[PDB]
Specification:
The structure is cut from a larger assembly and holds five copies of chain A. With about 550 residues, chain A is mainly β. The first copy, chain A, is about 5% helix and about 30% strand. In chain A, strands 1, 2, 5, 6, 8, 13, 14, 15 and 31 form a nine-stranded mixed β-sheet that branches. In chain A, strands 3, 4, 7, 9, 12 and 30 form a six-stranded antiparallel β-sheet that branches. Chains B and C meet through strand 1, helix 1, helix 2, strand 2 and strand 4 of B and strand 1, strand 5, strand 6, strand 7 and strand 8 of C. Chain E: It is found in: Virion.
């Protein structure tokens, strides 16, 4: 039957691996209990923000300190945003290890999700003083309102870049972030000035009101009102995208192609000698020496970029990313000297997302340490005027430059999936030129999965006056159960080598006992890269 | 901890170390409900009926149910001495139930701690909490080469490297039930052999053909074993040929 | 021999105490073999052994291909009905307590009350109070035997 | 076509993993080049052997030294024995890692094998002195003779216990061991004597001629004569056996069943307390304390055995094995103090089988270090007379005994597959009581795969006189290509836990660079156990 | 050297089991004492689970009014012979020869294990029983000691 006293759903959180020849189908189930409470206000608001912490108020650091600007302007809505976009939502640590061990590449296929077992109740404080008593009792007639945005009419806020998502741990309750989106504002800081150098000045700062766009959800999309006995279905969503490679590439531009002819060593621990005179294609007008350094090739692996590039835009300063690569060949190590140069990134996360203790935030800095073939770091490169049998002069050689070598010839490679905290998918901008590849999320989508908004309908007291001054409402909160199923498909991996592999494990910075629960139940999900095993590029 | 009555000293020189209860577990919020025991299914007169009238027996099939679910909350308004509590229903509240059919979880229902559903039908029951062991080394050396009549612990602790931690949420489907819906188990069929309900009094000398004897002529007289008989004897022995060998 | 420790909920007279029942298995007298009482001698022949070549006090395991032996059987009220085999290359030949060892045993049944949180759950992990809740349900089962 | 100048076969050595739901099919191909040369003699011979190295000639070690006896008596045949029984024959290091990672259990299914591309040629030395010239030239009419023993009429010599098999490395040539089998002989050494203690004496030593059995291959089985253009097929063989478990078991008798009731700790790094008064089944007449040590259980895991048991048999002293277990819980380590007690075993192997350098033999001692649940070591056990609430006295407690606790209640577990060097299969003896489980090879077979015998037919000179004194024969050798295919099937493994596993890698005693070839081409195959991942027993 | 199985097992012999019915012999495995120097004439070693038949004129005997004895040492089975006083065990098995300590010569133990392959008496003409009866017990014997 159906009604107040019948449950509308069940709890399924588990994964399935379906193997058929050269094909893997992964079906991820996720079910979470979501704790929601009444909105801070029933109105939309639009407000400017302060600069932020550590933004310079003085000229003493002469502009180098202005990277700290968080200033912006938003429209905050009463709605809460619920998305599953992250790897740690769908997979357990052992499930993700199973996937990245046994698969070559993978892509998401289809997704649907549900909301059910809706409970709403009110708080009544009769304590009337010290030793106060509160009562939590059901409102059987009360509304949870749900809006799925399928056509993507609303601005896109679910990118998982603030790591605000449904929790990673299945047996813990979750809370949603409030939905809000930017409005048009000019923030322009001038750190390079003609008249007065070593200064910074703001030219245009403020909200641009003339063309401003304000979109409520009420006008754009249909909203479903639900009571305690009814439930909600998403419908099916089908991804259209390309698989992402689960193998890292170690080969640089000198690890590919036919290797230079050599004379093999006669003894043990002896080294071969490069034959001096060989048939070769050389760059420039050069036969002597004909070396592996200069020889033609069809492609180039990696490109230099000015890094870290700080783009001062109309909205404020941003980072323009370079390509992902490991600084390990140059002597970088997590402990000791850290070289951030590889388009490295850090995650900040709390107890709700893969963190050990409550009330604190933990940081994981990922240098991308397995990708060593792509590493191109501009201060280390050089260029010379003539390439020939002569060695260049002091002039006609330029050591220290920073340039962008991205060209038609460059083959490059992205970050790939990052467990737990990485976003699974992202959204293309609509522009005449779409980006060629993503800087974080492995999958860029034209239509991304529709954004799902959740709100408690207001329960007013009897005193609402229609004049606007008094609209009290009784304190209300709710809980519902969110279920979802995401299907992946990929290619089966088989050994390409004689010797054994290093199968995906735990980063040296992690130990096994911190992964499992504690005496008080505290544990943290380990980091794993989506690409833990090598393969040949070309 | 070790437990009660485990030796902290060498005074009983190791003979006291049998008292060790030390172990390491993973405790789960779930409670375990099993009927495994004889007193659950039978009354004293029913069990007497069975063991009187049957030779052997085996279990065949089993199913079980959960229903008439009631959930309610406690509200203490007393605010001091002469305190008043209120017990009132939550009509929307969930009892969650997980049957593990494929036996993916470690096996804790052996009835070795006699924690089961009650024996008396008209009394209310309470379930034990489910928990299972994790890998740990406990090795006590009561026999030592250098220092006899001592005891020493070699390796004690949890082995963290290979540890296995399995929640129920990830392994099996969980059913959420409210006050009006009920739960069915499905049918389970035992595959096993009958067990014999008769005790055996015969030793190795109560079986087979008995030694030849001369019957007694009078009452309360005893027979005599014939000295020279045809027999298979163990070893190289004809004298005496006795029922022993 | 084995002893059962049980309380008022399981076949016990008074509340707040535990009662003990020690079962010596007193009807099985044909199987009784107790190592201190056995002996062995070197030669079995018409001669009676000497003081040497006779060993009285030893403790050894005489389980052999020839031994016929027998288990405890069902114990009312407190005995387990069934048990579980371990998965090993050599499964045990017979059980030391439960009369029936099963490969798949009856599935384990787990029961829990879903949490009822107050309005103060903060997502940070420090404060997650929940309202005191209890429940009651009725468990029914049917077990069929044949003999 | 066919003839002298047409090749009869091709080289296939590679593996295939076929995945369908919950099922894995592994198809192993192996092809090896075998170098064979003319037999040392064309006759069967029967001879006694010496004791061996390090056998005592004196009473100074008073019998403890007599374990070194290798004395026996054999009948040596001109035939060579070719078997593939070993793991390293069929699998590469990466293929075996693939199997033991992705499978629960496995069993062999069917097998066939081939011999082809037969070449036979003779050696002609015309050098006539210093600066000697040899010529190697084909005999187009010459015979390789091949005998497959399908009905197992001949004694079983292919157990891989001397690790004499086809090579592990596919690109290297191989050589076969000579086939020979025991004859009846009495070797009885008395180390325990009534009259004169601390002596050793041999009672009966020699060949027992009255009932001796001598079986040639010529009379028992059909022999196939092949020339350079024809080839040989085995036919299909189907294994009948049970799968072997690829997971090691860590649970002891106190890691199984319902755990003792405890009070959980309130703080972090706090430990729980065992509740003193609980409902329990206890052994003996004992309520106080009711402890996890004494509580009833349906089974017992592991059994003690006198170890190392030296059985002095009619053939000589042997080892009677105990159960396999790890001495690691007792403080054993490869480096430092080594405890051999767990039925541990060592492999001795040469360049042809997984060894780095030629002309030397390498040793790998496997303590079985992952099986810690089965460990029962007799000196450490004790027994007492009464089990009750009283603590036993000094009398009524026996510490140091060595007894066999194997009983109807014991659950125990075998070695499992050992890569590279372990035998895959073995043979049951025909006796009224067959063994319950194997001490080495994972699979015991009633009919094992038929033994395959290979021999070069003799090429006599013109001087054979029929009198027996002069039968010279021209020096001859050959090479042929052996191909075989072994099919395995097993069950797919899926994660049973939340946290990540430790996936099978390389033993701490090995490093990766010793696995791959050298400057001169030298490398050794790594050791892997067939059970590298844990699982719950009960 | 490793092997998959072991042939034969030691047993305390002759094991005298004092049971509820009285003392009995608990048999060991059948084997020949001939490799150790046993002979029908001269020194007789009864150790192999040997047995004697006592029979009269009605059963295969020459003269009336007397009983004849035939002692069968099982003399053709020499591969199964394992006799506990002759076996030893040592603590460590390695390249070193054990010390005086860590070596135990004289023990009597039951080495029947999961690995042991063993073999029975077989038919004995004239006097051997052809068949026998199993006991009904939870564990039936694996093999017969006579029939």
């Amino acid at each position: 039957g159906s009604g107040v006293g019948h449950s509308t759903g069940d709890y399924n959180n588990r994964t399935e691996f379906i193997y058929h020849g050269d094909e893997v189908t992964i079906i991820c189930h996720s079910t979470r209990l979501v704790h929601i409470n009444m909105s801070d206000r029933e109105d939309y608001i639009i407000y400017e923000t302060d600069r932020g912490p550590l933004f310079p108020t003085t000229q003493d650091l002469q502009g180098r300190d202005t990277l700290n600007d968080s200033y912006h302007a938003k429209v905050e809505t009463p709605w809460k945003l619920l998305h599953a976009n992250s790897w740690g939502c769908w997979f357990s640590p052992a499930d993700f290890q199973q996937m990245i061990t046994t698969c070559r590449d993978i892509a998401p296929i289809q997704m649907h999700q549900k909301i059910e077992n809706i409970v709403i109740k009110t708080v009544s404080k009769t304590g009337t003083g010290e030793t106060e008593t509160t009562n939590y009792n059901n409102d059987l007639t009360a509304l949870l309102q749900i809006a799925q945005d399928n056509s993507n009419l609303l601005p896109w806020a679910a990118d998982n870049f603030y790591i605000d998502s449904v929790g990673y741990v299945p047996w813990r309750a979750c809370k949603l972030p409030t939905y809000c989106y930017h409005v048009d504002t000019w923030n322009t800081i001038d750190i390079n000035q003609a008249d007065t150098p070593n200064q910074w000045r703001e030219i245009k700062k403020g909200i641009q009101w003339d063309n401003i766009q304000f979109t409520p959800l009420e006008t754009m999309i249909n909203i479903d009102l639900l009571r305690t006995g009814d439930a909600w279905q998403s419908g099916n969503y089908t991804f259209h995208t390309k698989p992402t490679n689960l193998a890292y590439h170690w080969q640089s531009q000198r690890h590919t192609g036919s290797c230079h002819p050599t004379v093999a060593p006669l003894v043990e621990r002896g080294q071969g000698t490069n034959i001096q005179s060989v048939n070769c294609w050389q760059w420039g007008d050069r036969n002597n020496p004909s070396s592996a350094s200069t020889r033609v090739s069809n492609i180039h692996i990696g490109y230099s970029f000015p890094e870290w590039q700080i783009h001062y835009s109309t909205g404020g300063p941003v980072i323009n990313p370079g390509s992902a690569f490991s600084q390990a060949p140059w002597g970088s190590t997590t402990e000791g000297t850290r070289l951030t140069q590889g388009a490295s990134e850090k995650a900040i996360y709390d107890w709700s997302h893969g963190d050990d203790q409550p009330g604190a935030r933990e940081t994981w800095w990922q240098n991308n340490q397995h990708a060593t073939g792509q590493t191109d770091w501009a201060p280390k490169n050089a260029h010379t005027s003539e390439l020939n049998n002569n060695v260049p002069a002091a002039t006609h050689f330029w050591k220290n430059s920073y340039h962008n070598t991205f060209s038609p010839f460059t083959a490059v490679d992205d970050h790939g999936p990052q467990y737990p905290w990485g976003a699974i998918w992202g959204k293309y901008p609509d522009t005449t030129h779409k980006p060629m590849m993503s800087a974080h999320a492995p999958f860029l989508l034209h239509g991304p999965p529709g954004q799902l908004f959740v709100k408690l309908a207001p329960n007013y007291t009897d005193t609402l006056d229609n004049g606007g001054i008094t609209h009290p409402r009784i304190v209300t909160y709710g809980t519902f159960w969110w279920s979802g199923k995401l299907v992946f498909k990929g290619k089966l991996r088989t050994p390409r080598q004689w010797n054994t592999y290093n199968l995906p494990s735990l980063d040296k910075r992690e130990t096994m006992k911190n992964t499992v629960p504690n005496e008080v139940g505290h544990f943290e999900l380990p980091y794993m890269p989506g690409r833990c095993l090598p393969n040949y590029t070309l």
